[PDB]
Design a protein around this motif. Structure first.
Motif, PDB file in Angstrom:
ATOM      1  N   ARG A  36       5.323  24.823 -25.755  1.00 22.90           N
ATOM      2  CA  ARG A  36       4.368  23.725 -25.832  1.00 22.90           C
ATOM      3  C   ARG A  36       4.924  22.441 -25.246  1.00 22.90           C
ATOM      4  O   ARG A  36       4.536  21.349 -25.654  1.00 22.90           O
ATOM      5  CB  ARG A  36       3.920  23.498 -27.269  1.00 22.90           C
ATOM      6  CG  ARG A  36       2.800  24.410 -27.724  1.00 22.90           C
ATOM      7  CD  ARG A  36       2.596  24.376 -29.228  1.00 22.90           C
ATOM      8  NE  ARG A  36       2.761  23.027 -29.753  1.00 22.90           N
ATOM      9  CZ  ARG A  36       2.805  22.722 -31.045  1.00 22.90           C
ATOM     10  NH1 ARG A  36       2.691  23.675 -31.957  1.00 22.90           N
ATOM     11  NH2 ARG A  36       2.973  21.464 -31.425  1.00 22.90           N
ATOM     12  N   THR A  37       5.839  22.546 -24.293  1.00 17.72           N
ATOM     13  CA  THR A  37       6.589  21.409 -23.787  1.00 17.72           C
ATOM     14  C   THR A  37       6.227  21.027 -22.360  1.00 17.72           C
ATOM     15  O   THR A  37       7.074  20.553 -21.606  1.00 17.72           O
ATOM     16  CB  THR A  37       8.081  21.673 -23.906  1.00 17.72           C
ATOM     17  OG1 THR A  37       8.809  20.624 -23.267  1.00 17.72           O
ATOM     18  CG2 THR A  37       8.442  22.938 -23.305  1.00 17.72           C
ATOM     19  N   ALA A  38       4.980  21.241 -21.962  1.00 15.64           N
ATOM     20  CA  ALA A  38       4.574  20.891 -20.612  1.00 15.64           C
ATOM     21  C   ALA A  38       4.510  19.393 -20.383  1.00 15.64           C
ATOM     22  O   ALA A  38       4.705  18.954 -19.248  1.00 15.64           O
ATOM     23  CB  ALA A  38       3.227  21.511 -20.308  1.00 15.64           C
ATOM     24  N   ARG A  39       4.311  18.599 -21.426  1.00 16.72           N
ATOM     25  CA  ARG A  39       4.215  17.162 -21.236  1.00 16.72           C
ATOM     26  C   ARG A  39       5.569  16.535 -20.974  1.00 16.72           C
ATOM     27  O   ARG A  39       5.670  15.608 -20.170  1.00 16.72           O
ATOM     28  CB  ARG A  39       3.584  16.505 -22.440  1.00 16.72           C
ATOM     29  CG  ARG A  39       2.986  15.183 -22.121  1.00 16.72           C
ATOM     30  CD  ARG A  39       2.953  14.290 -23.327  1.00 16.72           C
ATOM     31  NE  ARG A  39       2.053  14.756 -24.368  1.00 16.72           N
ATOM     32  CZ  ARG A  39       2.460  15.286 -25.509  1.00 16.72           C
ATOM     33  NH1 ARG A  39       3.751  15.418 -25.750  1.00 16.72           N
ATOM     34  NH2 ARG A  39       1.570  15.660 -26.410  1.00 16.72           N
ATOM     35  N   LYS A  40       6.610  17.025 -21.640  1.00 13.57           N
ATOM     36  CA  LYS A  40       7.968  16.551 -21.396  1.00 13.57           C
ATOM     37  C   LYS A  40       8.445  16.906 -19.996  1.00 13.57           C
ATOM     38  O   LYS A  40       9.038  16.064 -19.317  1.00 13.57           O
ATOM     39  CB  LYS A  40       8.897  17.118 -22.461  1.00 13.57           C
ATOM     40  CG  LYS A  40      10.365  16.848 -22.256  1.00 13.57           C
ATOM     41  CD  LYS A  40      10.722  15.380 -22.259  1.00 13.57           C
ATOM     42  CE  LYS A  40      12.216  15.219 -22.372  1.00 13.57           C
ATOM     43  NZ  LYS A  40      12.911  15.912 -21.271  1.00 13.57           N
ATOM     44  N   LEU A  41       8.121  18.110 -19.516  1.00 12.45           N
ATOM     45  CA  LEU A  41       8.514  18.525 -18.174  1.00 12.45           C
ATOM     46  C   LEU A  41       7.757  17.755 -17.102  1.00 12.45           C
ATOM     47  O   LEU A  41       8.370  17.279 -16.141  1.00 12.45           O
ATOM     48  CB  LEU A  41       8.297  20.023 -17.992  1.00 12.45           C
ATOM     49  CG  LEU A  41       9.080  21.009 -18.851  1.00 12.45           C
ATOM     50  CD1 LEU A  41       8.316  22.254 -18.982  1.00 12.45           C
ATOM     51  CD2 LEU A  41      10.388  21.338 -18.233  1.00 12.45           C
ATOM     52  N   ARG A  42       6.442  17.567 -17.267  1.00 13.75           N
ATOM     53  CA  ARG A  42       5.706  16.863 -16.224  1.00 13.75           C
ATOM     54  C   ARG A  42       5.922  15.360 -16.274  1.00 13.75           C
ATOM     55  O   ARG A  42       5.971  14.735 -15.219  1.00 13.75           O
ATOM     56  CB  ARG A  42       4.219  17.212 -16.253  1.00 13.75           C
ATOM     57  CG  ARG A  42       3.325  16.435 -17.167  1.00 13.75           C
ATOM     58  CD  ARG A  42       1.971  17.055 -17.227  1.00 13.75           C
ATOM     59  NE  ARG A  42       1.249  16.813 -16.000  1.00 13.75           N
ATOM     60  CZ  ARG A  42       0.112  16.145 -15.947  1.00 13.75           C
ATOM     61  NH1 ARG A  42      -0.415  15.677 -17.064  1.00 13.75           N
ATOM     62  NH2 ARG A  42      -0.497  15.956 -14.789  1.00 13.75           N
TER      63      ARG A  42
END
Lengths: 139, 24, 91
Positions: free
Chosen positions: A7-13
């Motif tokens: 659920r960590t797509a926001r940290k990566l993008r």
RNA sequence: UGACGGGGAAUCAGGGUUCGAUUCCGGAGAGGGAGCCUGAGAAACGGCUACCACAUCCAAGGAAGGCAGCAGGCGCGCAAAU
RNA sequence: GCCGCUAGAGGUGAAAUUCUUGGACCGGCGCAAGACGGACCAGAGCGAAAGCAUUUGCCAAGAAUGUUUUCAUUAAUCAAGAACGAAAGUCGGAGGUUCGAAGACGAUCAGAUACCGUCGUAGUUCCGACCAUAAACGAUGCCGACCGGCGAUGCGGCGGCGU
RNA sequence: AAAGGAAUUGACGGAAGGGCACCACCAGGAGUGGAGCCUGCGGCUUAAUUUGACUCAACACGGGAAACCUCACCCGGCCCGG
RNA sequence: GAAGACGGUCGAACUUGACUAUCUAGAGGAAGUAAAAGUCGUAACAAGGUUUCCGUAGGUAAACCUGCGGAAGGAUCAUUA
């Protein structure tokens, strides 16, 4: 180690959105300050008026006197230094002529062996320097 | 130039600059 | 303004080895205090120099490297000059 | 923001990245702003009423304006047709 | 401070500035001042890192091991936020023996306003209030797993001839 | 249009350690350096005092001890062997 | 059943105040990076001739020098019961 859960797509993008700015071409072409300091303003060529004819010496391992012209552009009024390319193509130019000035081939960086000059002259008074140089047209 | 003294010389320069800017 | 200088001022330049020269001034003033104007001499002429203590003489300042002409530049820029008292001994 | 949005476009091994004013759909506007008449349907401008701005004719009493429709000329431009 | 001898002491590559017949340096017994904790002191210990050393107390705190004790997932890393953070530095007070930036002199050099000597302010020292930087270095984030050996060393536990 | 990292060979040191040699010292001898003289070189003068060489790897060296030739060098003249 | 007129609302526009973007003329004055045959010296690399460098504080034409604490990227991985 990267942040690699599910659920960590926001940290990566929102990481790669911010560490794209340390890439130099993305910052130089997407911040907007390069387009305001450039004398063309993003054009391919610019028409301008020859102020004065210069000679500039080459950088240190070469020895020559490169023939160049100082142009003042019609479009925004900035003053540039442009290099009149072929042999004997300085003599076809009168002062206070319209010349059509293109970049030197390395997209904002000024090199060759000629210091601080990144522009070259294509036309003078709507006849091109190849046609003047080969003897195909006249003044 | 040893980089501490480059740092010290820009330190003296900025100290004189902030001296000259707050007179007005 | 303080008192004018005494009768004459001599500049003597001598050689040391290589591409170097060692230049002196002689006899500026006995009345003038702040004879640490070497500090203004060194910081304007871009040279290393000092005053060496010579007895019964004109308080000689020795500078390294040739300025006769820069003394002429500086002393007409500043108060003490009549511009007929400076005798050049350069070779 | 040199931003109309989308269907889409050019590259492309898989992933991506960039572009899309543009012939289809949807929005917005007819120099800038307002306010209305008729009409089933408008805040219409190949309708009207003023203000701003710019302009044409005049007997200096007054009259009429709107190509971001097709062609065309001015101008700006590196850059676009009868 | 008191002795009781004497013409040099200091310091350096060499010297000079400095001290000395109003008695220095050295020797003796004493008093006081402030700093500091040598040798033991190691690839040994503790601490979150900065760091930490005389004795005996008192005050809380902690890793490790031992556990057939209890709770039953309480956990790992960390935006915001906070605690500590060498030395130098700044302010208020007390203290000041030595060292010692700035500075005053001496001498080395062509010149040294540098190293080398004599003296010294601010500081070094303590109690409060700030500042938050270091080659703060293992130039190596933290938690967990797995993967060869060897001989010691610090701590805790268990088992073994002996001395 | 490179700045930088690690590593190899070489040069260099105002670093550490060995080795050799009478173009090194030690054991020592004849000496040299001070003296008159031949001779070379530095200067000084000349019309010219021709010239190359300046620490061994210049200075009794050009096998150079030149009266003319040598002979370059000076003063005056013949000469084509253009 | 037309003009006009009190009031109501939507309200372009002008008026004097602000404040706040973007570009422009900026006398001076302070900085750079190239050009590389200027001048003054050697601060760094060899124990670079005083080992270098980091943090801070003072000074000086200049590289830099000195103090107190730290590091070896040191010129020692070691020096004896």
């Amino acid at each position: 180690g990267k942040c690699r859960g599910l659920r960590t797509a926001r940290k990566l993008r929102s990481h790669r959105r911010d560490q794209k700015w340390h890439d130099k071409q993305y910052k130089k072409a997407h911040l907007g300050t390069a387009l305001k300091a450039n004398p063309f303003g993003g054009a391919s060529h610019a028409k301008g008026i020859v102020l004065e004819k210069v000679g500039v010496e080459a950088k240190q391992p070469n020895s020559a006197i490169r023939k160049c012209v100082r142009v003042q552009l019609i479009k925004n009024g900035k003053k540039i230094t442009a290099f009149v390319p072929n042999d004997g193509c300085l003599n076809f130019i009168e002062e206070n002529d319209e010349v059509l000035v293109a970049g030197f081939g390395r997209k904002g960086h000024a090199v060759g062996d000629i210091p601080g000059v990144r522009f070259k002259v294509v036309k003078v008074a709507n006849v091109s320097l190849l046609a003047l140089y080969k003897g195909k047209k006249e003044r | 130039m040893r980089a501490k003294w480059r740092k010290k010389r820009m330190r003296r320069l900025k100290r004189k600059r902030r001296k000259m800017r707050q007179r007005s | 303004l303080p008192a004018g200088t005494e009768d004459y001022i001599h500049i003597r330049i001598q050689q040391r080895n290589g591409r170097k020269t060692l230049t002196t001034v002689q006899g500026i003033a006995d009345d003038y205090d702040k004879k640490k104007l070497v500090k203004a001499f060194k910081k304007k002429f871009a040279c290393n120099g000092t005053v060496i203590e010579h007895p019964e003489y004109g308080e000689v300042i020795q500078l390294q490297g040739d300025q006769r002409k820069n003394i002429c530049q500086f002393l007409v820029e500043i108060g003490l000059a009549k511009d007929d008292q400076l005798k050049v001994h350069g070779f």
